[PDB]
Paper text:
A special junction to assure a smooth connectivity is needed to link the hook and the filament, which have different structural and functional characteristics. In this junction, the first segment, composed of the [name] complex, is in contact with the hook, while the second segment, made by the FlgL complex, connects to the filament. The junctions made by [name] and FlgL play important roles in bridging the hook to the filament. Once the hook is completed, [name] starts appearing at the top of the hook to form the first junction, followed by FlgL that builds up at the top of the ring made of [name].
Here, we solved the three-dimensional structure of a major fragment of [name] from [name], strain ATCC 700819/NCTC 11168, using X-ray crystallography. The structure of FlgKcj58, in which 11 C-terminal residues were not resolved, comprises the fragment [Asp69-Gly568]. FlgKcj58 can be described as composed of two domains. There is a central domain, D1, which could be divided into two sub domains, D1a and D1b, and a more compact domain D2, consisting mostly of β-strands. The structure of FlgKcj58 reveals that the cell-proximal half of the protein, which includes the N- and C- termini, and which is known to connect to the hook, is structurally conserved when compared with other known [name] protein structures. However, the cell-distal half of the protein has diverged, developing a different 3D structure.
Author numbering: 70 to 569
Write the structure that this text describes.
């Protein structure tokens, strides 16, 4: 009857893990329905149709306003969808603190019970058994929360010993990951702490000499094990997110969705000539950092700075090359060089430079900034050949941002939709660039995942892969949960049968 009770605790630990897991994964799936034309997919469709209406009538300023309107709706939808996952992750983080608080109350109440059971005084038989009943009750409740090891040696009432004294630590020990929460009559709590203002709770066992044993990566089982696996266990203060975790993995795919959407759209829109182009603020971009190391989506290759006059004729092309050592200073050295051995038209005409290109790092802000201002009578564009240099840095881009939470339309476009162009040459007439953005919705593009894989899909296919992954996780867990219930009921019936 004591052995089946040992099985009941283990059955509870497994069932409460998958039960908490099922509740959280079901909520996430309700937020991310694996259905076409809902949520972001519906906003993405209205966004692409808005590009189609604009490419049909690029001179009508009303279609520019409608396009910017549908783009802001899309980015905001991407912001809110990420905020939904962020809120659930913070909810799990708060549950971790509550569960740890409950674990400590249980352990303290068990250690206090043990002070009577193993105390010097003799207790009435009935009071001793109801204290023992309560301790078994608390032990069983504890198994719903965490995997804990209770090692017990039971007292023999043959007497033949008194007056002696009791060694309570040898009679009862309750441990978590090997560390004694209850050592006989002594209570040792789990400790919570955090370092940044996300209050990413870490779980510690502290020794009497204030030495620290972090358990965040080791604690498993029950509600706490599921909370840790959902939220993430290794927090990173530099990056302000978790290095693992089921929910964290959904957030990273959502960021990778936005990052690719920003990169691939901006790569195309950067090829539309403009009077000047300005990057976003590039946080931490010193002039000596290799570009492929600053942004993992930057690939070796080349892009061409392209110069047009105000009537829309291509006057110039300067090819800038990126390899795995190319820094921003290196980009400037190539831009600010001369040579240019070319043979355009006509009569050896191409002369000097028609742009003022600039990079600057603000040591007080920690941000870098890249600008190319074409001189009056000229426009500048960037046509990339694999690097995503302009797209990742939003040089002449349509979208700003780096992830799902800061994705937005570029401010100069939001503030004046009439600045939107559809043509490569910058004249407010053609539509060869906007047609490329329309076709981009069908194109297999790269998604650089945090796990190290590179998905090659369309935007919609990648997002549906995320909602399918969430549904597949919730279903796989439902199978493990289902067998956990049957095992729990079977063990619970055996426990009831083998008792009173």
């Amino acid at each position: 009857d004591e052995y089946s009770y040992y099985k009941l605790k283990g059955a509870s630990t497994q069932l409460e893990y998958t039960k908490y897991m099922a509740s959280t994964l079901q909520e996430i799936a309700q937020r991310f329905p694996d259905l076409q034309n809902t949520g972001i997919l519906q906003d993405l469709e209205n966004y692409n149709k808005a590009w189609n209406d604009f490419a049909s009538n690029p001179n009508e300023n009303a279609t520019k306003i409608a396009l910017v309107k549908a783009s802001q709706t899309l980015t905001e939808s991407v912001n809110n969808t990420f905020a939904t996952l962020d809120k659930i992750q913070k909810k799990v983080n708060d549950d971790i603190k509550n569960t740890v608080d409950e674990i400590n109350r249980i352990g303290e109440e068990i250690a206090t019970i043990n002070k009577q059971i193993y105390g010097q005084e003799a207790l009435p038989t009935e009071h001793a058994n109801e204290l023992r009943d309560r301790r078994d009750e608390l032990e069983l409740t504890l198994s719903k929360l965490v995997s804990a090891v209770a090692s017990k040696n039971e007292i023999n009432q043959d007497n033949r010993l008194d007056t002696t004294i009791t060694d309570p630590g040898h009679q009862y020990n309750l441990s978590i990951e090997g560390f004694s929460i209850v050592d006989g009559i002594n209570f040792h709590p789990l400790k919570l702490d955090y370092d940044d203002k996300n209050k990413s709770y870490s779980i510690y066992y502290e020794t009497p000499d204030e030495k620290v044993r972090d358990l965040t990566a080791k604690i498993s089982g029950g509600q706490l094990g599921a909370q840790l696996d959902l939220r993430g266990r290794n927090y990173s203060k530099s990056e302000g997110k978790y290095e693992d975790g089921i929910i964290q993995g959904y957030m990273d795919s959502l960021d990778t969705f936005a990052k690719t959407m920003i990169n691939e759209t901006n790569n195309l829109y950067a090829s539309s000539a403009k009077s000047s182009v300005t990057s976003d603020y590039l946080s931490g971009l010193k002039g000596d950092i290799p570009l492929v190391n600053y942004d993992r989506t930057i690939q070796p290759g080349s892009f061409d700075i392209v110069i047009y006059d105000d009537k829309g004729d291509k006057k110039l092309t300067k090819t800038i090359t990126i390899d795995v050592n190319t820094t921003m200073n290196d980009i400037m050295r190539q831009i600010n060089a001369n040579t240019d051995d070319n043979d355009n038209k006509n009569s050896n005409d191409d002369v000097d430079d028609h742009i003022n290109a600039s990079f600057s790092y603000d040591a007080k802000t920690g941000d870098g900034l890249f600008q190319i201002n074409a001189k009056s009578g000229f426009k500048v564009a960037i046509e990339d050949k694999g690097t995503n240099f302009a797209g990742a840095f939003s040089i002449g881009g349509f979208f700003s941002g780096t992830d799902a939470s800061d994705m937005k339309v570029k401010d100069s476009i939001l503030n004046d939709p009439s600045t939107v162009r559809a043509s490569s040459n910058g004249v407010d007439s053609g539509n060869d660039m906007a047609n490329k953005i329309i076709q981009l919705q069908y194109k297999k593009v790269n998604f650089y995942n945090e796990d190290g894989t590179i998905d090659n899909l369309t935007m919609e296919e990648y997002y549906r892969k995320l909602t399918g992954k969430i549904a597949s996780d919730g279903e796989n867990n439902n199978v493990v949960n289902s067998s956990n219930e049957t095992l729990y009921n079977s063990v619970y019936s055996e426990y009831q049968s083998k008792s009173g």
